[PDB]
Design a protein around this ligand. Structure first.
Ligand SMILES: [Zn+2]
Length: 140
């Protein structure tokens, strides 16, 4: 589990979104496994605005933050998980590392802020849903 709290936005994995998220929906995209809902309280996370390919992610199933290199956001074929069938997922970045279903929502961060959240795992790879292209998170 986990979210990003920027401005009056909460960014979560679409497959973990709550009723309250859908009841306060701003934007969602199944192909990216993302959903954004509106918040009453201001959040304090900063979204990275960059093309970094190195950063650190939180892996809840190891209670550890791991430094990783990660790929550029792309359309990646992902094997079946407990929460999606095998499919293409868009705006996804891969690293070599551990990720199990409960790790979804863990933050990937670089020097500029939050890059994205864990979304995929298996075959010794971790996949992160990029948020750096969602420039509207910075405003309004
Ligand atoms: Zn960066």
């Amino acid at each position: 589990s986990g979210a990003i709290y920027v401005g009056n936005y909460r960014v979560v994995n679409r497959h973990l979104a709550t009723h309250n998220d859908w009841a306060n929906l701003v934007w969602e995209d199944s192909s990216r496994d993302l959903l954004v809902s509106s918040t009453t309280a201001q959040g304090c996370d900063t979204i990275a605005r960059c093309d970094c390919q190195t950063g650190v992610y939180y892996c809840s199933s190891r209670r550890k933050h791991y430094p990783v290199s990660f790929s550029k956001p792309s359309l990646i074929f992902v094997e079946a998980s407990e929460y999606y069938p095998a499919r293409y997922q868009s705006h996804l970045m891969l690293a070599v590392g551990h990720s199990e279903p409960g790790d979804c929502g863990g933050i990937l961060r670089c020097q500029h802020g939050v890059v994205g959240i864990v979304s995929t795992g298996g075959n010794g790879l971790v996949g992160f849903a990029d948020v750096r292209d969602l420039l509207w998170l910075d405003e309004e």
